[PDB]
């Protein structure tokens, strides 16, 4: 098809074409001989309008050809994927072996039948005391991490990837890691940390940079998730998906939407945002009759720290809870800076207690919450005037919350705590108070 | 019908020519793959279809077939104990046929079973002058509910041939000669979801429904055909409240709709619900339940259709004269599908991104439920009582969906996770919550219980509201800052809080409480009220009244455990008060 | 009848090859199955006519359908037998009796009253409520609305004013036009209960429009009632009073349709023409020179989130000749009806006070009760701000007065009628609590007459 009619920015209009389909891959043979790949964004009787991945610069319309590849964006799935690093479209950026794929899969996949899902069963020990204890992660869950620009979410991400394990199964998670539109220093942090710890042996990495095409960014989460579902539901592996940063996906999504001349809904994002996000996020869980599973830790930055911003808002409704990272804590030097007040895991009740973790799990978590509650209420009322507004009991709460934030949550991004250790240190932090301020009847269980 | 032709595929928007016979809102099988779609606009023969499925790999030249109807449901034998999505796809069946755990693109399967044999039992003799909503026979469908086969809307004539026998829902079971000619009636009928089923007359829902749950039946009651809305903050035991209603309530059937919930959260409804035991039969609660399931993952049309398909089913059983309960959770996710739907249609947005006709959609929904007179000669009385959960993002009142629901519906049970942190179950906030049926329930309740029940309930409400009055004062100063007269009242309400309001869903006896038992428990704490107030007024002091009555107040704590058989056990509390009060005259 | 439907886009439909179709004209749509649907001509241009169908365009086949062009805009079939009858928003036999045979058909938009032809509101209507009769006097012809909120008892008050409303001369030619706008079936049925229980039906036409009725029917509702109202007021010559509930429900429908037509949303999401559109409804109230009998309007509106600077209450405020406010704080205290008289005002009140209409003393009693109740509230204010000892003896009595003013005066229950005489009698009684020296707003001769 030598019938390039128009070029308007990235977009290109091919006429008198034959039997093309929406979201089909193309190649553009330029008159110099250079080849650029592209995707169909729209098709009509005569015409079909496309967007060029690389960009449109330096193309003579007359003497350039368009080849229609016949298929959408595909991932060549293989078990030689473990230990490899790919780009946002699945080409290798590591210079290893060939990677001859067992087969090619569409990157959208198919919705899990709502009655084919299985309850998220088993406890995942992330090694992080604010998660494993207060906001417990369960295999098959979707537990995201809300953060902000210039916060250590980067670090947390790599930690959960290196530390997370299920208790006594000798099963290791395969870690599918996807980076969407992150800087170099950001991508290098990750790939280095995985090589420095042997974490890459357990991982398949999809690495998309901020200066990569906007259409590649959008592909990356779907690319990574297709490899996850593959390893999990065709190879029967327990898979843990970590993806950052979703804001960058949504941002890239706006770029194409505005390119397809689509009128945005709430807050300038597409109407179909919710579906798009659900489409990605609900590619997870256990499946009745299948060995493998997909757990999902999505990571996003909250633009201007606004909770009601569509990106953290819509993600709220879809995922079972969320993990919050405040500037207030990171500036106080908290590692990791998890604010447990707004933080929640909606499934924590499925895998905690006798024979799962330990007996005291619930009580401590609930007792630590309301003690830390008044703890930060005493601190904000301490600036009313002190100490003429702090009583004998109030003093112990600002003294509780300070040590709670410093000694309990603030553990450092390379410290790996067990559930044994987390509850013990929680007991000993609780021990700061008299047995009157309630915690079960046998509270003398640990002292 | 005529085969149409794709002329443009832009995102989820499809253009097609030859669509001249199709109507607006007609459902379509778009493209080769044949994905689901709906005609939104027509220009000449060119139709504009919204497709609610991955449109990738769909190009022009491909065909577009119309189903020939707007979004409908198949109504008949094989519908109870079934799990569907918002567009009524058999989820069980889907697995067996696709041999797959995944909802594949454009795979089409009949809603009900067209190959299942049933015993059709004729109950109307040949030569009968029939109209819509008349019973022509019955099928014993489940271990509980009897499927009454009805005359479809539109047909009116005379029965020529009717036999009892074993037929599929595709076999003719009847021959009625109408003004047109022979029209065979089959076992199943269809019905557009968005259009409400006809009735003879709408009547005020005045018959309160026994939910067994104390705080509801007593203080915030819903009538058979009334509507209630529930906030859904996390950890407030919402599912527990839902299930109690779903079983204890004296409705014949239950319709549950999951609008568009979190995957793993949706699986909890799927696992838990069938394992609910029907209070009366002992059989699975499913045997009198139709359940709709929708992950957020589901096609947006399905998420939007969720409550409409639900209530269309709920109506088809109401026409049989039954009492039906429709539960949807949440209606916020539904509204969230409407919002997206609005966005994709490039409409002028209303408030906070919702379409301007949101309040109208809700009114359209909550007014399809009520006490009715069904069609047909029998003039049978059915009803739909509507229970809807709302999850307002950050748990809010301001949000439009909540405000518009509360503008049309009468009862509001406000679940509070602070009262759940205080271990108060069920978690209903007695101050915030309300029921408009209150003063109407007085009329029916005083009539049927031969007592001053309304005078009792609204008195308890003066006490509980006065508690919050005093709790502001107690927390203000100290405690002794109140004379015995206030100090008495603070405990009276505390007795209501722990001995009447607090109810345990799991305890074999406390799980359900009937009218008498409820009336009694309410009175025997109210009998304590007036008696001790006359005691304190004539010299006797606070401390004297309390320390000694412990023999009966720790026996008042037991009231909620007396079996229904042992009526007079609580009735005898009215005596022990009049004696122990006479002990303080010495 | 034209068989040429070219386009349907949402609730909007384009019919070509038409002739002499007029703007605002009424249509009907014959669907391929047999169903009939009413509609409006929005915009007519060339041989094309673009229309919006009331019940929506849901399930229409374009090829096999037809349109009839009625040749006349919205119309109400008027007759004097309409009294005691219930019609819908489009004014059809909703109450099941003998079908009405209308004298004529009036366009619901009616016509503007010539400013010179207009007679200024004079005389008095006995509402039965002390806070409206005495301090914010409703005057035949006036526009006087109710400012409310959700869950407040405006519905109770609407049902009460409809019953207790009557004139102080020939009560024989007094009627009440009641409009239900977008209310629920059970809200409707409540009004049907209170009307056919006290028999206010026997002097009233009812227009019952529902929350699930098509939005365009909700828009039409008040214009029908007002057409019915002017007809009974000039044509038949009666002092007619109009009650219309949830004006907010009207505006909700207005912005819903406005958005359907893709109109540019003005302030707070409502159309730029919100002011004017409401005026084509409220200004219909008033009197006419030489013509006996008048139209008076009592619109009811719930203030969204109690906000008075909200478009609905504000733009109504900018039109009407005063306002009647219902506050949370007073319904909280069990005062029925919860009327706060401080923020309320009737502008044309002085045309229904003095001898003949009410009583000569009317003026001073109103202006003394206000000036006192105001200071009594200012006292109630510093009462629990600097301790109840900071307000002296002079202050203390006034605070006891404001206390009895709400419980006994403003509170009167939704089922007990009060005549102006009773209002004035009880008014002087509360006033008694003050020394004759502090009662300075009243001159000497008005004083010595009232025990």
Swiss-Prot record, chain A:
Q: Which UniProt keywords apply?
A: Ion transport, Sodium, Sodium transport, Transport
- Please give the InterPro entries that the UniProt record associates with this protein: ATP-synt_VA_C, ATPase_a/bsu_AS, ATPase_F1/V1/A1_a/bsu_N, ATPase_F1/V1/A1_a/bsu_nucl-bd, P-loop_NTPase, V-ATPase_su_B/beta
Induction text: By increasing intracellular Na(+) concentration.
Q: Name one GO biological process term.
A: sodium ion transport
* Gene Ontology molecular functions: ATP binding; proton-transporting ATP synthase activity, rotational mechanism
UniProt keyword Ion transport, yes or no: yes
**Does the record bear Ion transport in its keywords?**
yes
**Would you identify the family this protein belongs to, as annotated?**
Belongs to the ATPase alpha/beta chains family.
Q: Which PANTHER family match?
A: V-TYPE PROTON ATPASE SUBUNIT B
Sum up the protein's function in the record's words. Involved in ATP-driven sodium extrusion.
Q: Which NCBIfam families match?
A: PRK04196.1 (NF003235)
> What is this protein's record name?
V-type sodium ATPase subunit B
From Swiss-Prot, chain B:
Could you say which enzyme class this protein belongs to?
Answer: translocase
User: Any idea which GO molecular function terms this record carries?
Assistant: ATP binding; proton-transporting ATP synthase activity, rotational mechanism; proton-transporting ATPase activity, rotational mechanism; sodium-transporting ATPase activity, rotational mechanism
Please name every pair of cysteines joined by a disulfide bond in this record: none
Q: Which UniProt keywords apply?
A: ATP-binding, Ion transport, Nucleotide-binding, Sodium, Sodium transport, Translocase, Transport
Gene Ontology CC: one annotated term:
proton-transporting ATP synthase complex
Entry's induction text: By increasing intracellular Na(+) concentration.
Q: What is its EC number?
A: 7.2.2.1
Residues that coordinate or bind ATP: 232-239
Highest taxon above the source species? Bacteria
Q: Is the Translocase keyword given for this protein? A: yes
**Which Gene Ontology terms describe the biological processes this protein takes part in?**
proton motive force-driven plasma membrane ATP synthesis
Q: Reaction(s) catalyzed by this protein?
A: 4 Na(+)(in) + ATP + H2O = 4 Na(+)(out) + ADP + phosphate + H(+)
Entries under InterPro entries matching the protein: ATP-synt_VA_C (IPR055190), ATP-synth_a_Xtn (IPR031686), ATP_synth_asu-like_sf (IPR023366), ATPase_a/bsu_AS (IPR020003), ATPase_F1/V1/A1_a/bsu_N (IPR004100), ATPase_F1/V1/A1_a/bsu_N_sf (IPR036121), ATPase_F1/V1/A1_a/bsu_nucl-bd (IPR000194), ATPase_F1/V1_b/a_C (IPR024034)
Q: Name one Pfam family in it.
A: ATP-synt_ab_Xtn
Regarding protein family, the annotation reads:
Belongs to the ATPase alpha/beta chains family.
Role description: Involved in ATP-driven sodium extrusion.
> What's the name of the protein?
V-type sodium ATPase catalytic subunit A
Query: Could you tell me which species this protein originates from?
Result: Enterococcus hirae (strain ATCC 9790 / DSM 20160 / JCM 8729 / LMG 6399 / NBRC 3181 / NCIMB 6459 / NCDO 1258 / NCTC 12367 / WDCM 00089 / R)
Q: What is the lineage of its organism?
A: Bacteria, Bacillati, Bacillota, Bacilli, Lactobacillales
Q: Tell me the gene name.
A: ntpA
From Swiss-Prot, chain C:
Q: Would I find Cytoplasm among this entry's keywords?
A: no
GO terms assigned for molecular function: ATP binding; proton-transporting ATP synthase activity, rotational mechanism
Q: Which GO BP terms sit in this record?
A: proton motive force-driven plasma membrane ATP synthesis; sodium ion transport
PROSITE patterns the UniProt entry points to: ATPASE_ALPHA_BETA
Pfam families attached to this UniProt entry: ATP-synt_ab, ATP-synt_ab_N, ATP-synt_VA_C
Induction line: By increasing intracellular Na(+) concentration.
Assigned keywords, A-Z: Ion transport, Sodium, Sodium transport, Transport
| Entries under SUPFAM superfamilies matching the protein | C-terminal domain of alpha and beta subunits of F1 ATP synthase (SSF47917), P-loop containing nucleoside triphosphate hydrolases (SSF52540)
InterPro entries, per the entry: ATP-synt_VA_C, ATPase_a/bsu_AS, ATPase_F1/V1/A1_a/bsu_N, ATPase_F1/V1/A1_a/bsu_nucl-bd, P-loop_NTPase, V-ATPase_su_B/beta
- Functional description taken from the UniProt entry: Involved in ATP-driven sodium extrusion.
Q: Which family does it belong to?
A: Belongs to the ATPase alpha/beta chains family.
Q: What is this protein called?
A: V-type sodium ATPase subunit B
Q: Which organism is it from?
A: Enterococcus hirae (strain ATCC 9790 / DSM 20160 / JCM 8729 / LMG 6399 / NBRC 3181 / NCIMB 6459 / NCDO 1258 / NCTC 12367 / WDCM 00089 / R)
The lineage, from the top, is: Bacteria, Bacillati, Bacillota, Bacilli, Lactobacillales
Underlying gene: ntpB
């Amino acid at each position: 098809y030598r019938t390039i009619k128009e070029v308007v920015g990235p977009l290109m209009a091919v006429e008198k074409v034959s039997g093309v389909k929406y979201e089909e891959l193309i190649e553009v043979r330029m008159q110099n001989g250079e080849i650029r790949r592209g995707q169909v964004l729209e098709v009509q009787e005569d015409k079909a309008m496309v967007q060029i991945f690389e960009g449109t610069s330096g193309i003579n319309l007359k003497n350039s050809s368009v080849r229609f590849l016949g298929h959408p964006l595909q991932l060549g799935v293989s078990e030689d994927m473990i230990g490899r690093v790919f780009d946002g479209l699945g080409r290798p950026k590591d210079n290893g072996p060939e990677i001859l794929p067992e087969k090619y899969l569409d990157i959208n996949g198919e919705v899990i039948n709502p009655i084919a899902r299985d309850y998220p069963d088993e406890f995942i020990q992330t090694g992080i005391s604010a998660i494993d204890h207060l906001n417990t992660l369960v295999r098959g869950q979707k537990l995201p991490v809300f953060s902000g620009s210039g916060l250590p979410h980067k670090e947390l991400a790599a930690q959960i990837a290196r530390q997370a394990t299920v208790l006594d199964s000798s099963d290791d998670f395969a870690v599918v890691f996807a980076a969407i539109g992150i800087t170099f220093e950001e991508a290098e942090f990750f790939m280095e940390d995985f090589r420095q710890t042997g974490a890459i042996d357990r991982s398949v990495m999809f690495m998309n940079l901020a200066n990569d095409p906007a259409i590649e960014r959008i592909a990356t989460p779907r690319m990574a998730l297709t490899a996850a579902e593959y390893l999990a539901y065709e190879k029967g592996m327990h898979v843990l998906v970590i993806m950052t940063d979703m804001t960058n996906y949504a941002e890239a999504l706006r770029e194409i939407s505005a390119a397809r001349r689509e009128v945005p809904g709430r807050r300038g994002y597409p109407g179909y945002l919710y579906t798009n996000l659900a489409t990605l996020f609900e590619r997870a869980g256990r499946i009745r009759g299948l060995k493998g599973s997909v757990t999902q830790i999505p990571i996003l930055t909250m633009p201007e720290d606004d909770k009601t911003h569509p990106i953290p808002d819509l993600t709220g409704y879809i995922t079972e809870g969320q993990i919050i990272l405040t500037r207030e804590l990171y500036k106080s030097g908290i590692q990791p800076p998890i604010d447990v007040l707004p933080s929640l895991s909606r499934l924590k009740d499925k895998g905690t207690g006798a024979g799962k973790t330990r007996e005291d799990h619930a009580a401590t978590m609930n007792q630590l919450f309301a003690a830390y509650a008044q703890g930060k209420q005493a601190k904000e009322l301490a600036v009313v005037l002190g100490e003429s507004a702090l009583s004998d009991i109030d003093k112990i709460y600002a003294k509780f919350a300070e040590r709670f934030e410093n000694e309990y949550v603030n553990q450092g991004f390379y410290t790996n705590r067990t559930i044994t250790e987390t509850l013990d240190l929680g007991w000993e932090l609780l021990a700061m108070l008299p047995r009157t301020e309630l915690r079960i009847k046998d509270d003398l269980l640990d002292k | 019908m005529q085969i149409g032709k794709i002329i443009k595929v832009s995102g989820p928007l499809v253009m097609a020519e030859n669509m001249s016979e199709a109507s607006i809102q007609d459902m379509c099988l778009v493209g080769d793959l044949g994905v689901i779609g709906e005609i939104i606009e027509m220009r000449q023969d060119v139709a504009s279809i919204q497709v609610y499925e991955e449109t990738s790999g769909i190009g022009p030249g491909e065909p577009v077939r119309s189903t020939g109807e707007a979004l409908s449901v198949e109504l008949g034998p094989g519908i109870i104990s079934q799990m569907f999505d918002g567009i009524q796809r058999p989820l069980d069946t889907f697995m067996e046929v696709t041999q797959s755990n995944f909802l594949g693109r454009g795979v089409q399967l009949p809603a009900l079973d067209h190959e299942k044999q049933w015993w059709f039992e004729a109950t109307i003799e040949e030569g009968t002058e029939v109209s819509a909503g008349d019973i022509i026979g019955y099928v014993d469908e489940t271990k509980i509910i009897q499927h009454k086969i009805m005359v479809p809307n539109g047909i009116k004539g005379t029965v020529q041939k009717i036999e009892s026998g074993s037929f599929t829902i595709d076999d003719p079971i009847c021959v009625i000669e109408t003004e047109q000619g022979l029209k065979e009636l089959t076992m199943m009928q269809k019905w557009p979801v968005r259009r409400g089923r006809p009735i003879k007359q709408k009547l005020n829902p005045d018959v309160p429904m026994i939910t067994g749950q104390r705080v509801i039946d007593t203080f915030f009651p819903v009538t058979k055909g009334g509507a209630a809305a529930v906030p859904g903050p996390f950890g407030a035991g919402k599912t527990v409240v839902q299930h109690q209603i779903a079983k204890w309530s004296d409705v014949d059937l239950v319709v549950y709709v999951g609008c568009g919930e979190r995957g793993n959260e949706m699986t909890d409804v799927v696992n838990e619900f069938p394992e609910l035991i029907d209070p009366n039969t002992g059989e699975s609660l499913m045997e009198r339940t139709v359940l709709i399931a929708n992950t957020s993952n589901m096609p947006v049309a399905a998420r939007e259709a969720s409550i409409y398909t639900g209530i269309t089913i709920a109506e088809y059983f109401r026409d049989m004269g039954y009492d039906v309960a429709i539960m949807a959770d949440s209606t916020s996710r539904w509204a969230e599908a409407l919002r997206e739907m609005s966005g994709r249609l490039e409409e002028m947005p209303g408030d906070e991104g919702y379409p301007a006709y949101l309040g109208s959609r809700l009114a359209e929904y909550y007014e399809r439920s009520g006490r009715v007179i069904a069609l047909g000669s029998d003039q049978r009385e059915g009803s739909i009582t509507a229970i809807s959960a709302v999850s307002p993002s950050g748990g809010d009142i301001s949000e439009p969906v909540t405000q518009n629901t509360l503008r049309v519906v009468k009862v509001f049970w406000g679940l509070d996770s602070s009262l759940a942190q205080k271990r108060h179950f069920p978690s209903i906030n007695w101050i915030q919550s309300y029921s408009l049926y209150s003063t109407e329930v007085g009329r029916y309740m005083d009539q049927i219980l031969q007592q001053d029940w309304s005078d009792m309930v609204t008195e308890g409400m003066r006490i509980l509201q006065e508690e919050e009055q005093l709790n502001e004062i107690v927390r203000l100063v100290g405690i002794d800052s109140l004379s015995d007269n206030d100090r008495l009242t603070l405990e009276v309400a505390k007795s209501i809080r722990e001995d009447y309001l607090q109810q345990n869903a799991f305890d074999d006896v406390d799980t359900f409480t009937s009218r008498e038992k409820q009336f009694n428990m309410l009175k025997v704490i109210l009998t304590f009220g007036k008696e001790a107030r006359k005691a304190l007024s004539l010299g006797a002091y606070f401390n004297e009244i309390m320390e000694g009555t412990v023999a009966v107040r720790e026996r008042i704590s037991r009231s909620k455990y007396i079996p229904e058989e042992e009526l007079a056990k609580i009735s005898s509390i009215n005596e022990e008060i009049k004696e122990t009060i006479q002990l303080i005259v010495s």
